Amino acid sequence: NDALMDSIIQHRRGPPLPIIDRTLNRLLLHTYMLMFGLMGKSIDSTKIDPTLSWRAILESNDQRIAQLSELLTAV
């Protein structure tokens, strides 16, 4: 569960990531944890690869903008 899955992921320095991708990458980590174990090994540390995390934080930047801009016009 997320109790220990949070501990597996190394703490990030930047802003809190959005939820559209956190629930995706942690699900991928969960699937990876379940498979390697069948093979016989366990993962205890994992970095987020933040060169990909910035692209993910860029999405909401222009996405929240689309949500609010269509409000700005009374179409």
Binding site: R13, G14, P15, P50, T51, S53, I57
Partner: peptide, 11 residues
């Protein structure tokens, strides 16, 4: 890597 510093500065 530059993206990490970018995130730091944005925070």
């Amino acid at each position: 890597p530059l993206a990490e510093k970018q995130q730091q500065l944005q925070l």
